[PDB]
Write an enzyme that holds these catalytic residues in place. Structure first.
Site, short mmCIF file in Angstrom:
data_model
loop_
_atom_site.label_atom_id
_atom_site.label_comp_id
_atom_site.label_asym_id
_atom_site.label_seq_id
_atom_site.Cartn_x
_atom_site.Cartn_y
_atom_site.Cartn_z
N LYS A 69 38.96 63.71 139.36
CA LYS A 69 40.22 62.97 139.10
C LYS A 69 39.98 61.64 138.38
N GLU A 109 43.97 49.07 146.89
CA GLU A 109 42.73 49.55 146.33
C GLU A 109 41.59 49.33 147.30
N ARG A 110 40.63 50.27 147.27
CA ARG A 110 39.49 50.27 148.09
C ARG A 110 38.41 49.46 147.41
#
Lengths: 468, 50, 499, 56, 62
Positions: A156, A182-183
């Site tokens: 992805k 967001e990580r």
């Protein structure tokens, strides 16, 4: 000057009391002067008597009651330009990426009103892509929105990368990838990877801009990164006539961020524990994304459902704005075929005779029906055995497996790993190719030579190569 | 033709900010004072006739 | 040019007037506003705020009034002066709205020029008594089989269209509007429909696609489109079917037929849900208010067929439902169903598997909607409704008994299902649909096999007009088949079946 | 003209079914058709070459 | 009111006109000159190919 002293800090909800003839409006930016930074508060209610109720963009922890606040006179104003491309920015409009300041040119408010009715798409315009697999089985469009499915870290991220490169060739356009919740470990990897494959640079001008809202920042900052990325895009279309392809990450975190804001503000959660403001906030976002009469913001989004559930209210609302699904899968990638796009579950509501051409719809359906029948055939072929095929039956199997390999296309981004230069193949040449498999010019061309090819012309050379 | 269309758009905003400058010029002058008297006599005729 | 349009505008306004009462707002926001004062205001009055935004009085309280905002929060500010419009909430009615795009306020939002009106009449009104009502008699033609007379709809019916959202839900509705174009340009005014397509909660982009599509299909000159899109805030979506329906009633009390399509009543329920919870009213069953029912029943009974007194007027309805996965355990779908009579259950599973329209006929019924059809359209479809609910049972056990009789029914039934399909956005004429259903009802799909059904159809029609159009002139005018006409068709159909 | 090509194509196909040596006459027919179908898609692509100046 | 008086003065005193040509060229596509490459499609040039094919080919034989 409109000034007041903080008279509460209930959660991330900070209430400021203002004096007489000194009045906010709802959506304005409040800046609390502090030696610890600044804190941006957004007016999300009026409780009257010259008091407000706000949400915060940063941790409220350590606030005194009595610290001065100053009212700007309207919403947060975030930088725009081609100086804001190749920069990570939090909501406030300032570098978190630490490459000194962003050279301000023009700045624009983060909230803006939906474009006129006469300036909403009156027709579907087909967004061009170099990926052939994408343009046949689920046409991208300049007004449409295409919701990715599949795992994360399964191809992805690289797929997102690919799309940026095509858009540059196709139009000239840029991008903005906006990450909500967001990580922060993964952000480094993606930032490094993007610079390296040259869709971002330290050498000048860039395509994709990144907008990141960390998860340790309050709920409010998670919602408002999504409106902040979009404004960058809206300036390229309306004022430079150029196409923009705007990615959004998880839209599961969009719904999540609003429910908390609701709860804290004294609203009551709705169906499935979710925000009572779910439909209207989403509607505003996705009527800010459309084909204008200069340029267009198209958006590719990533759809992740609440523990495998499609009856919940938040996917449903989303699905209404979407006009296509690209459904990435693990079973396709185990055959070493990237693109990962599962052919059968790749469908569009703009794939039709009247939109894409009659020819196009018909080529795309035959190729679909063939895979669909192949799949069913294989089911009873396992149990009975594989001696059961007739001359006719194997004709569907042969044409299907030729397409199955033929799917894989070397990706430019993923150039090292394949070792084969990435190719692009325009819309007209996508139709023609599949026609050729239909007339059987490519129904005797080796099955292991369809592996990682481009256009119709290209695979003549690979065919010579397997044999020789 | 596209640029001409834009030019119409440009024109519309340009002509807007000029009117914002004149609002500031009017409130700056003692027209602020010559015109409050005018408001006053209009308001007198009106309120008399409720 | 750009100087001239501005000069016109500035001259077309002056914005000097003398006022009655004012308020100054108490504390504003959340799509509901709290106003201080407004002591002589009537209920459901229109107020106009200093922002420019207007609202409808909902709660009249002894010291304060709580208006509801028709518009986004951000424009309304605290300490603004609110002035009484002096008039109850109304929307313009008249025939200067046909082919003008409008929102729910009645504004031209691209428009096709400013808005002209005979009258205005209140958004909210209550429908006539029991006494001025009359049963249907005239058939609605959709120009699609499987509804044509297989699942009948008449003129003044309130028959439902149910299915999963965006399976092509919208097209079934357009065809109704489109097919009525040669009975809508008549000299029989009872046969004309003037149609309003309410788009609630849909994308502003889709609606713009829809406005253009109708002007290509040359049908926008006898339809209005109303808008309260997804972008536009919830209290405007709530009011969107009500405001549009006032416009529908205006055609209905001039004694002429009409239609209104409420897409999607499940989205009216959401719009009203958000407004309701932010006013502190606790959620009911399925997290939707328990007063949802009230909105739909009041709304729906203003589409009804009237008697001879009222000019034998009608306003028909096709209410469009967003089902939660083909479940009918859910509150909102059942509420619309229990008020209405008839259902047009539609299947996603069928749509995917090449049945366009995918109108399942097992959970589709007509109750009082079955006296719509004129005699030709009772004869030809005769008991086909029954036969394909013998077909369902025959296929439950075709995973007991296997007999020629059961097999024969199953073969007829599959063949019959294929036959129902028809091209979308060119709906086949009613006169043209009358021979095709005869064939199949009279069991003449024992000579046509499934692959050739489409081919036979066009070749059979071409044949019939060139051989004998007498048959077709009869059905255009008489609209009733006689035994002799029927036999003449049977004789012709078998001739075509052989060769 | 164009028709001439297609009658000879099929004339040599039925010639090849018999004698050996028209088995690559068709390889040439295929070649002239390749570039000839290129003239058809060229020729279908051509439109009137004027720039408008009436309205625009 | 004050609007009518202001509008009028402003309009007369500050009239916009269409942008200069230089300004137009930078923001627009700077036209396109006559598309001629010169030289139409060259294939099978000189009898070199003719000798090559007449000699190489021969295939009438089983």
């Amino acid at each position: 000057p409109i000034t007041g002293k903080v008279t509460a800090v209930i959660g991330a909800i900070v209430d400021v009391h203002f004096e007489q003839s000194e009045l906010p409006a709802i959506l304005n930016a409040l800046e609390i002067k502090t030696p610890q930074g600044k804190l941006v508060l957004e007016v999300a209610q009026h409780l009257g008597e010259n008091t407000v109720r706000t949400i915060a963009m940063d941790g409220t922890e350590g606030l005194v009651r009595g610290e001065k606040v100053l009212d700007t006179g309207g919403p947060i104003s975030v930088p725009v330009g081609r100086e804001t491309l190749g920069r990570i920015i939090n909501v406030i409009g300032e570098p978190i990426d630490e490459r000194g300041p962003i050279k301000s040119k023009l700045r624009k408010p983060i909230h803006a009103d939906p474009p006129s009715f006469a300036e909403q798409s009156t027709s579907a315009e087909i967004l061009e892509t170099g990926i052939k697999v994408v343009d046949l089985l689920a046409p991208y469009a300049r007004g449409g929105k295409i919701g990715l499915f599949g795992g994360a870290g399964v191809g992805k991220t690289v797929f997102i990368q690919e799309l940026i490169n095509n858009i540059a060739k196709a139009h000239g356009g840029f991008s903005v990838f906006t990450g909500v919740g967001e990580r922060t470990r993964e952000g480094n990897d993606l930032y490094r990877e993007m610079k390296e494959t040259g869709v971002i640079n330290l050498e000048g001008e860039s395509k994709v801009a990144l907008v990141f809202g960390q998860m340790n920042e309050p709920p409010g900052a998670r919602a408002r990164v999504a409106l902040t990325g979009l404004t960058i895009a809206e300036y390229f279309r309306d004022e430079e006539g150029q196409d923009v392809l705007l990615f959004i990450d998880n839209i599961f975190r969009f719904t999540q961020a609003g429910s908390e804001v609701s709860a804290l503000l004294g609203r009551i959660p709705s169906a499935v524990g979710y925000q009572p403001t779910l439909a209207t906030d989403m509607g505003l976002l996705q009527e800010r994304i459309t084909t204008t009469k200069k340029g267009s913001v198209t958006s590719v989004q990533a759809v992740y459902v609440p523990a495998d559930d499609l009856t919940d209210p938040a996917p449903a609302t989303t699905f209404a704005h979407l006009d296509a699904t690209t459904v990435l899968s693990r079973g396709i990638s185990e055959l070493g075929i990237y693109p990962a796009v599962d052919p059968l579950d790749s469908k569009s509501r703009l794939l039709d005779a009247a939109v894409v051409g009659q020819e196009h719809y018909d080529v795309a359906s035959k190729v679909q029906e063939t895979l669909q029948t192949y799949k069913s055939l294989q089911d009873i072929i396992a149990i009975l055995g594989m001696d059961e095929l007739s001359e006719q039956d194997k004709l569907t199997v042969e044409r299907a497996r030729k397409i199955q390999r033929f799917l894989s296309q070397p990706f430019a981004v993923a150039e090292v790993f394949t070792g084969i230069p990435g190719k692009l193949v325009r819309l007209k040449d996508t139709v023609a190719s599949f026609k050729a498999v239909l007339e059987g010019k490519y129904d005797n061309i080796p099955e292991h030579a369809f592996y990682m090819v481009g256009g119709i012309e290209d695979v003549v050379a690979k065919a010579e190569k397997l044999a020789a | 033709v596209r640029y001409e269309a834009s030019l119409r758009q440009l024109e519309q905003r340009q002509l807007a900010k000029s009117v914002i400058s004149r609002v500031q010029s009017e409130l700056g002058n003692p027209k602020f004072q010559e015109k409050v008297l005018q408001q006053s006599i209009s308001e007198i005729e009106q309120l008399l006739s409720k | 040019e750009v100087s001239s349009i501005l000069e016109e505008r500035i001259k077309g306004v002056s914005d000097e007037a003398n006022l009655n009462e004012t308020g100054r707002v108490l504390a504003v926001g959340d799509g509901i506003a709290r106003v201080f004062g407004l002591n002589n205001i009537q209920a459901e009055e229109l107020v106009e705020f200093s922002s420019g935004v207007k609202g409808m009085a909902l709660n009249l309280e002894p010291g304060q009034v709580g208006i509801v905002l028709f518009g986004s929060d951000r424009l309304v500010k605290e300490g603004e002066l609110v002035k009484r419009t002096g008039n109850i909430v109304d929307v313009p009615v008249g025939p200067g709205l046909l082919g003008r795009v409008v929102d729910a306020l009645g504004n031209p939002i691209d428009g096709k020029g400013p808005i002209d009106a005979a009258g205005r009449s209140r958004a909210q009104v209550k429908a006539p008594g029991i006494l001025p009502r009359r049963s249907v008699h005239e058939p609605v033609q959709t120009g699609l089989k499987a509804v044509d007379a297989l699942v009948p709809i008449g003129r003044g019916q309130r028959e439902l269209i149910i299915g999963d959202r965006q399976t092509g839900k919208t097209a079934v509705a357009l065809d109704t509007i489109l097919n009525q174009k040669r009975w809508n340009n008549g000299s029989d005014e009872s046969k004309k429909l003037y149609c309003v397509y309410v788009a609630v909660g849909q994308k502003r982009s889709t609606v713009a696609q829809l406005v253009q599509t109708l002007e290509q299909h040359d049908a926008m000159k006898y339809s209005i489109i109303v808008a309260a899109t997804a972008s536009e805030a919830a209290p405007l979506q709530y009011l969107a079917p009500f405001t549009a329906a006032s416009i529908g009633e205006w055609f209905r009390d001039n004694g002429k037929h009409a239609l209104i399509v409420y897409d999607d009543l499940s989205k009216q329920a959401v719009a009203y849900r958000q407004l309701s919870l932010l006013l502190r009213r606790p959620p009911g069953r399925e997290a939707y208010p328990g007063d949802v029912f009230y909105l739909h029943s009041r709304l729906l009974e203003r589409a009804a067929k009237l008697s001879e007194k009222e000019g034998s007027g009608s306003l028909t309805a096709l209410p469009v439902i967003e089902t939660q996965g083909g479940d009918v355990s859910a509150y909102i779908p059942t509420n619309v169903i229990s008020i209405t009579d008839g259902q047009i259950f539609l299947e996603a599973e069928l749509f995917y598997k090449g049945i366009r329209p995918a109108i399942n006929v097992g959970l589709s019924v007509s109750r009082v909607g079955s006296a719509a059809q004129v005699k030709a359209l009772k004869q030809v479809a005769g008991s086909l409704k029954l036969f394909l609910a013998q077909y369902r049972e025959v296929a439950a056990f075709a995973q007991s008994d296997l007999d020629a009789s059961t097999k024969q029914t199953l073969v007829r039934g599959e063949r019959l299902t294929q036959l129902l399909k028809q091209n979308q956005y060119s709906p086949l004429a009613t006169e043209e649909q009358v021979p095709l259903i005869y064939a199949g009802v009279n069991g003449h799909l024992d000579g046509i096999e499934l692959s050739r059904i489409g081919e036979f159809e066009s070749s059979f029609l071409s044949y019939l007009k060139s051989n004998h159009n007498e048959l077709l002139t009869e059905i255009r005018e008489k609209g009733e088949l006689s035994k002799e006409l029927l036999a003449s068709l049977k004789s012709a159909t078998e001739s075509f079946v052989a060769t | 003209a164009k028709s001439a090509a297609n009658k000879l194509d099929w004339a040599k196909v039925i010639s090849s079914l018999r004698i050996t040596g028209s088995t690559a006459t068709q390889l040439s027919s295929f070649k002239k058709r390749n570039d000839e179908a290129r003239r058809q898609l060229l020729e279908l692509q051509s439109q009137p070459t004027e720039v408008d100046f009436s309205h625009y | 009111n004050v609007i009518q008086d202001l509008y009028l003065r402003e309009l007369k005193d500050t009239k916009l006109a269409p942008s200069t040509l230089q300004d137009a060229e930078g923001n627009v596509k700077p036209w396109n000159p006559p598309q001629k490459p010169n030289l139409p499609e060259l294939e099978l040039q000189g009898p070199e190919a003719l000798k090559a094919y007449t000699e190489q080919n021969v295939e009438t034989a089983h």
